[PDB]
Amino acid sequence: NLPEHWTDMNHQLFCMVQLEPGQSEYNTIKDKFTRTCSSYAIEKIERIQNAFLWQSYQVKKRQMDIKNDHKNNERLLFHGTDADSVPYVNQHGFNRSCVSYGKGTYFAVDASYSAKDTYSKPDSNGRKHMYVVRVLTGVFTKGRAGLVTPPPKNPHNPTDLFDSVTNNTRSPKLFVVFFDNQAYPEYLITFTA
Amino acid sequence: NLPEHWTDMNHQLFCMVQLEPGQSEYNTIKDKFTRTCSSYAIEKIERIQNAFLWQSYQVKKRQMDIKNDHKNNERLLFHGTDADSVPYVNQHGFNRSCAGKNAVSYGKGTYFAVDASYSAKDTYSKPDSNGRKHMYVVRVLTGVFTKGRAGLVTPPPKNPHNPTDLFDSVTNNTRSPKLFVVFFDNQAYPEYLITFTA
Numbered sequence: 001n002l003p004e005h006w007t008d009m010n011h012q013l014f015c016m017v018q019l020e021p022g023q024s025e026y027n028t029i030k031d032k033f034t035r036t037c038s039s040y041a042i043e044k045i046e047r048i049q050n051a052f053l054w055q056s057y058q059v060k061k062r063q064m065d066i067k068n069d070h071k072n073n074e075r076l077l078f079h080g081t082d083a084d085s086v087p088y089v090n091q092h093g094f095n096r097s098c099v100s101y102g103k104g105t106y107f108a109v110d111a112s113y114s115a116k117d118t119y120s121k122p123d124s125n126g127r128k129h130m131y132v133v134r135v136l137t138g139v140f141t142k143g144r145a146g147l148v149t150p151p152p153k154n155p156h157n158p159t160d161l162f163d164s165v166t167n168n169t170r171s172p173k174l175f176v177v178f179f180d181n182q183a184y185p186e187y188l189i190t191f192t193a
Numbered sequence: 194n195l196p197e198h199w200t201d202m203n204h205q206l207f208c209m210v211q212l213e214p215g216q217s218e219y220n221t222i223k224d225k226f227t228r229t230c231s232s233y234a235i236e237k238i239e240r241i242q243n244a245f246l247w248q249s250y251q252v253k254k255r256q257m258d259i260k261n262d263h264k265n266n267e268r269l270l271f272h273g274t275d276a277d278s279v280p281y282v283n284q285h286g287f288n289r290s291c292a293g294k295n296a297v298s299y300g301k302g303t304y305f306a307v308d309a310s311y312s313a314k315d316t317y318s319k320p321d322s323n324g325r326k327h328m329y330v331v332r333v334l335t336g337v338f339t340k341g342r343a344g345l346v347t348p349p350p351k352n353p354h355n356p357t358d359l360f361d362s363v364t365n366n367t368r369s370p371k372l373f374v375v376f377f378d379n380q381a382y383p384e385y386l387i388t389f390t391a
């Protein structure tokens with residue numbers, strides 16, 4: 001079933017819902033962004049209500065919670081993208097087919113890393129786009145150029161994989177996931193430098 | 194929600210089940226195969242019982258069944274692979290990031306053949322050191338499809354002015370399909386593994 005904080009979708013399966021500034025949900029997401037991006041200007045925040053992406057994500061979450069025998073497999077991370085990818089992500093999520101720690105989709109711990117113009121490319125009017133993403137990072141190891149999946153947890157058990165890779169395991173600043181339904185885009189932040 | 198005909202797996206999540214010649218299950222697969230591969234001989238057929246792959250597959254099938262207009266979204270297709278790939282496929286399914294370039298490319302995804310003869314070629318089902326060839330029988334969510342193009346990394350849109358409303362798969366020929374390409378995870382469930390030889 002669809003999370004409690006969602007709003008009614010009149011029997012539809014997809015909706016982008018603008019948050020009211022100063023209400024609790026808006027303040028919580030705004031604070032995560034302004035922790036490292038307080039010099040920027042927030043035009044709006046939208047909640048992504050994608051029923052199909054949510055269902056597929058929650059399945060993979062239940063599966064990861066069984067496989068790893070604990071429930072700290074999920075992290076809140078950031079993803080900067082160009083305005084032309086936004087409609088695709090809203091509808092179909094992150095696609096690795098669209099890379100120094102591997103050929104997957106990249107998420108940042110800090111909004112400031114996602115805020116770089118090379119990730120959240122400014123459009124004509126200077127508008128920049130960053131997602132807040134639920135990511136199933138699960139059990140992770142250091143990444144390396146050319147990975148197509150995470151490496152195995154043991155060379156003698158070649159099909160038992162890590163869930164994600166990172167730049168640095170003691171102190172991660174990015175995570176790379178290699179499979180379709182391992183990230184759910186929860187909020188879109190429209191903002192300017 | 195695991196199928197009732199599956200072997201009980203105690204509390205384990207994966208099992209390869211050897212089928213018995215003379216079973217309807219084994220004979221329907223042998224028939225589908227020998228229809229185009231009458232010169233080869235089947236060593237065995239195993240049923241792939243992968244709980245996790247099955248769940249994620251059945252969620253995608255329910256979504257495509259809701260999305261499309263009462264369509265028949267699922268076809269049973271073949272996929273020849275090398276011995277080295279078989280443990281990965283059994284466990285994790287078909288990964289487009291690992292796919293070969295096909296000799297006639299209609300997109301960058303995972304390829305599935307209508308006819309066992311196509312999959313039976315040494316280019317796909319590479320003979321192992323003991324001369325065994327491997328081909329999967331695969332449930333594929335082909336849905337609504339179009340003729341693909343070598344450049345595709347996702348299916349094309351139905352309508353260029355609505356870029357995110359996609360076809361489900363592509364084919365070589367919409368009038369006589371012989372290949373399908375899929376571009377997403379959990380859109381194909383590997384149901385049976387056929388081991389065979391010349």
Ligand SMILES: Cc1cc(C)c2c(c1)sc1nncn12
Nearest residue numbers: 078079080106107108114119
């Ligand atoms: C190396 C790398 C590549 C990308 C694409 C990336 C990051 C780091 S952090 C971030 N936020 N959105 C996108 N990205």
